[PDB]
Amino acid sequence: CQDVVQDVPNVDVQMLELYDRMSFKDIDGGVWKQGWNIKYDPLKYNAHHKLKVFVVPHSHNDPGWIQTFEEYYQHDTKHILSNALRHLHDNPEMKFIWAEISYFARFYHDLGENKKLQMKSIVKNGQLEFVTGGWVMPDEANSHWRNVLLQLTEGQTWLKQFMNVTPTASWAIDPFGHSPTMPYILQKSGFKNMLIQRTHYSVKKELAQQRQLEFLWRQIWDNKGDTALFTHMMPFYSYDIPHTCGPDPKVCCQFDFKRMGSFGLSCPWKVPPRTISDQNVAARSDLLVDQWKKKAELYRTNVLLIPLGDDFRFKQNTEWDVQRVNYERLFEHINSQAHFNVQAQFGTLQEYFDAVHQAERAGQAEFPTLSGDFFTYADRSDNYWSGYYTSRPYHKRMDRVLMHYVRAAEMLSAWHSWDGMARIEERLEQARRELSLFQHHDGITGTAKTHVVVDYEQRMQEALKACQMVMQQSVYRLLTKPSIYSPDFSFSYFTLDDSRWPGSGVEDSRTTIILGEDILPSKHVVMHNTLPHWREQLVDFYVSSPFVSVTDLANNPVEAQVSPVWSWHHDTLTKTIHPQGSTTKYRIIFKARVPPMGLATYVLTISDSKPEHTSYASNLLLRKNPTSLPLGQYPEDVKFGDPREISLRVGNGPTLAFSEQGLLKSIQLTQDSPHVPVHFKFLKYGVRSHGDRSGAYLFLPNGPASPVELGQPVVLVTKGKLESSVSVGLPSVVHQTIMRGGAPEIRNLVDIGSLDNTEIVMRLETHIDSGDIFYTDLNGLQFIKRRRLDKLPLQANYYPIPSGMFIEDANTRLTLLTGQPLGGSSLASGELEIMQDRRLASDDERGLGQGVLDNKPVLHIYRLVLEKVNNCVRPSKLHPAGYLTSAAHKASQSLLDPLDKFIFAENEWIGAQGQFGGDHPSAREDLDVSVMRRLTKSSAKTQRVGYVLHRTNLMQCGTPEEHTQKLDVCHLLPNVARCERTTLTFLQNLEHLDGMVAPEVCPMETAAYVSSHSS
């Protein structure tokens, strides 16, 4: 295995180093506003060295943005595809590329057989070429790598089945900045080339000056370079026709033949396109070839890529004709006039890359190596696109919930083959497709119109229900005696109980387990653990009595704690935010111990009085002028007091101290150690009253954040043996710190209400001497070093926080893990901050045509890990990566892949079993089974199950590795006949494995295996 910590890769371009050196001056470069006046030697090309130009027609089709997926399909995309089919059929030299398989699959399945065959033909013959082949063109900032892979797999599996093709070139012209997670996944999925566009204008200038726009993009830790993927960065401001022919959009716009008037389009530079004729073609060709030759100066080979398209282009037949006929005339003239030394033609993306690599092999060019990322994007001036790291945070959180549900449903149901009547494959396909759709760069990003966000939400809700159905059918099958099992595939044997989605104070949707002597004495509950190691975790359920005790299925008592059910209310009479306790339901909490990739059953039983193994939390309400808080049968009376500082410790874990406002002020790791200052604070950013306004995309603050005025908030302290918490009702946020004996959990119920033009930030203030350095993750896959740059505006120093961030000095690290992607930064030494929600009255001039005024309450979840790191083996100061400790990684897993909880629906579960998976190997802590998916339906004689294995890299800090078992995924199901290593999409076999054993992967590596079973 490559060492990902101790060897700093030697690359030609390292983006953090580049950023440190660059001046980022925004000067007027002339017609190329963000560049310079490009000059070329006309003698560079001649009969023996011609410029080869590939004009690549395309149409950018957003799966939801200003209209829903279905609205766009009906109004635009179905016509684009139908007319592409006709025009490509009729014009054999015409070409077209297509990216979004969600639309293509929608279209294809509605075609008659004759048309399906015609479509297959234009694909087989290379006229229509799929690029990337994902369900969508995903966001790269907020998306989790597991869902980037999911959507890629969904689109490519469809393409392989119906089109018999698997793209090896990726096209990402629109995500708002670019992540190295993409080449990581693509290179492990058979790709050879990728194209990107939305990178900071200063980066395009810098790389263009050095002809470093094409590069071998490797991972930041990759010393050897095996992760490298050839990448083409487009050089100009947009992918539209005015910004793709060459540096001068006033000239290039004249070659967008849709802009002459009848289509309702024009050229903002005031010179319209002109129909190409024999009398003007020489002049028109001389203008166009000059643009091409200027663009070609920015690249190393004699092969030039000219995209020809824009949003929802190539709809009408008249549009196909106007572009095709005019370009054909230009090509005939240019290619016949030796003096140009150009050969121009319609091409596809693969054709471009093939020709570039032919030139490379001919010794014509050598390409630079590059590592790093391309955040945070700015398209112009100080307009940094860091707002979408937070926009519509309810749905960003929902994404992570559904991510987990999809994994759990696919894994739970993979253990068996299912009858078609069970509709398992149908429900899983629906859930995968809706989650995949949301990865779109206007879905998870929060940059779509309100009604489109509602569509995505409704789709995701249906997907959650689909996952629940599959999960609960699976649990019932896995834990019922086989000769008793008698499934009704429409029936709900269990309901899922989720304590953190939509969340307390968001939706009152959790079911109470109703027990009573005259109704039902006891209830079975089941926990699932999707991770491949034994896990203990506190779990909680609502019950109708405080007198409840827990047993395992060997009837062993389990220690439990009962607490009240507290809900916070904005009292519009008293103008306070305060908690109310239920007098009819209670929370019971206990530790569940669950096998790797397994299930464990427990029983909740009512009694008439306090059970031996159940304890009761105390509750203390801190506020002046208190009033009573009755709690029904709950056996401990609520206590009252004036606001005061408090301190809490659960088990042998950290001691946390809180301000009189209920906010953390210090953490003491052990009995002897210092009380380390760690202060939570809430602040607000506003919007500028002159110049550019923040909106869904852009964060344009009117200066540093100002503290939220807290008043005298009400603080609730619950103290228990197993779990304690401090909760406070702040303006716009019910903030909770929960302690279970290890790193605390933070929950924020964020309701920005009607606070217009406000962004609420949560900041941590510490003494850690972090300087200008901090670390943020990329897609939940890797941590990248960031350097705060005071030469850039505040909004440029904001980065995506898709799963965590940390600061550290020689001795101390503070890591904040997240259960939802949000934007954040470290704006001063010792600080971390993460945005909670933003409500913006104005549009930000990127075409969305609305502000962000559709906020809804969201429950954000976090873990906060303070650690000593002086003994850890860390990368050198020059290394661009950072790595989590074991505790921080486990804390992240606790947020993203918690135990699933099931409540048996009926009164009695006949044939119930106590456990599943007790014999499953408990793998080393850094290894995950990211995906387990049965790939075959029940009628296949050879069943196949696919696994994606990911090994992270955890810091060595002197905690001896304990004995763990080797995980061989190929032997998880019986009767294995074959084990193959595959691409991550499972679509290509790469290696037939000796002894049918799937080897574990190296740190930072991801591998896929398929096991075949003869049953």
Ligand SMILES: *[C@@H]1O[C@H](CO)[C@@H](O)[C@H](O)[C@H]1NC(C)=O
């Ligand atoms: C799928 O593509 C391959 C190209 O190598 C071809 O051999 C195979 O016959 C194709 N399958 C079809 C056309 O059904």
Ligand SMILES: N[C@@H]1[C@@H](O)[C@H](O)[C@H](O)[C@@H]1O
């Ligand atoms: N190019 C446009 C982007 O700026 C929008 O967010 C939509 O994705 C649209 O495609």
Ligand SMILES: [Zn+2]
């Ligand atoms: Zn788009």
